[PDB]
Amino acid sequence: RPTFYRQELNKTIWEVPERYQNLSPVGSGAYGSVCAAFDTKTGLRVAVKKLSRPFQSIIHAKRTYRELRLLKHMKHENVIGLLDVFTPARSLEEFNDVYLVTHLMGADLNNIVKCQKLTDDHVQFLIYQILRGLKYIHSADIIHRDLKPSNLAVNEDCELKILDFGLARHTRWYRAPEIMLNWMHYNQTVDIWSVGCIMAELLTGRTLFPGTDHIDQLKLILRLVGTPGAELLKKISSESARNYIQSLTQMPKMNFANVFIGANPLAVDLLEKMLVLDSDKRITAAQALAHAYFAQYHDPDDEPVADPYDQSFESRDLLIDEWKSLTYDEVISFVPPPL
Ligand SMILES: CCCNC(=O)c1cn2ncnc(Nc3cc(C(=O)NC4CC4)ccc3C)c2c1C
Numbered sequence: 001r002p003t004f005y006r007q008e009l010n011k012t013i014w015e016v017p018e019r020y021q022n023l024s025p026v027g028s029g030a031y032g033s034v035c036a037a038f039d040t041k042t043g044l045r046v047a048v049k050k051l052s053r054p055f056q057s058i059i060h061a062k063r064t065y066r067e068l069r070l071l072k073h074m075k076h077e078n079v080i081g082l083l084d085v086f087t088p089a090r091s092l093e094e095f096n097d098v099y100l101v102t103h104l105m106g107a108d109l110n111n112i113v114k115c116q117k118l119t120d121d122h123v124q125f126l127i128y129q130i131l132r133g134l135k136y137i138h139s140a141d142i143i144h145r146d147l148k149p150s151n152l153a154v155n156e157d158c159e160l161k162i163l164d165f166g167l168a169r170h171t172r173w174y175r176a177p178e179i180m181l182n183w184m185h186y187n188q189t190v191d192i193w194s195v196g197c198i199m200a201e202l203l204t205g206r207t208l209f210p211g212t213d214h215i216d217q218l219k220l221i222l223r224l225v226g227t228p229g230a231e232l233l234k235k236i237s238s239e240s241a242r243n244y245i246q247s248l249t250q251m252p253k254m255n256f257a258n259v260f261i262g263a264n265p266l267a268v269d270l271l272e273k274m275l276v277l278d279s280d281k282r283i284t285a286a287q288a289l290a291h292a293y294f295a296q297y298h299d300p301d302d303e304p305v306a307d308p309y310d311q312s313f314e315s316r317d318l319l320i321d322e323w324k325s326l327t328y329d330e331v332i333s334f335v336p337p338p339l
Pocket of ligand 1: 026028029030034047048049067070071080100101102103104105106107108153154162163164165166167
């Protein structure tokens with residue numbers, strides 16, 4: 001147990017140990033507020049997330065537990081890790097606050113692309129790194145479901161980290177069409193759609209699909225991928241959507257050569273295999289890595305798959321004290337990473 005201290009940061013109380021020096025609200029992080037802090041027992045520049053009412057609800061309680069378990073398992077370079085997990089709690093019948101810690105990067109891929117367009121080598125390193133992150137996440141049977149530049153954290157030396165994974169359920173701009181229109185059974189390839197919306201954007205400095213609603217967004221989608229054909233229009237079941245498509249203007253597929261003008265031929269080819277409207281035809285994270293474009297970066301011997309990750313709790317219906325105890329048990333039981 002360490003020396004604690006109580007401070008305030010923009011209308012909220014922040015109870016954090018002696019070691020966590022200098023704090024500052026850097027931006028909007030999933031579930032609660034995040035702070036930029038400077039460590040001591042390691043002495044680095046970290047990010048600290050204070051969860052918003054983590055146990056106030058059955059949703060919040062099942063989502064507090066979920067995250068703490070994803071980060072206690074994710075040991076891969078381009079995947080967000082867990083440096084520390086703390087509470088000001090003396091007991092379990094007190095424990096109603098949770099804070100998780102990990103390194104702070106330079107900027108996110110959204111603030112990177114704003115200033116400005118990135119060459120055919122920056123892109124090679126960034127997409128490779130995104131997908132190599134995805135491959136580790138995926139083999140542990142987790143999908144992202146909300147992959148977009150803002151959750152893709154990067155360093156000055158271009159080294160990448162994926163954020164806010166495995167939490168999403170129930171940005172649309174990088175969201176897969178089948179998960180947005182409820183067309184098919186769906187799989188881990190909804191993020192493979194996201195990377196092609198990201199890739200293309202680092203290659204043009206232009207949001208591929210800056211649509212306005214579920215209707216405008218999709219109209220922007222076909223406006224590039226061509227209306228579902230004879231192979232696809234059979235597969236879709238969704239009575240509303242299945243009847244909705246055949247009532248749109250007949251559009252052809254565009255040439256990704258005549259869209260991404262000047263682009264390295266292999267980028268055009270991989271993009272094509274990314275914006276496929278067939279969730280079963282579409283390429284996978286591991287498949288995408290063995291593509292000629294990543295010839296120089298790719299080495300299957302340094303692209304690892306994850307240690308088995310237990311999701312048995314994900315179908316479970318438990319009470320708040322049950323969850324609040326499971327998380328408490330995981331908070332107290334965590335052991336720092338080895339240097
Ligand atoms: C200087 C601009 C760049 N800033 C960053 O590097 C950076 C921004 N953020 N924003 C939110 N959470 C972070 N970290 C974080 C991420 C998760 C996370 O990704 N959750 C996984 C979904 C289960 C959980 C807790 C925390 C503190 C984080 C980091 C590191």
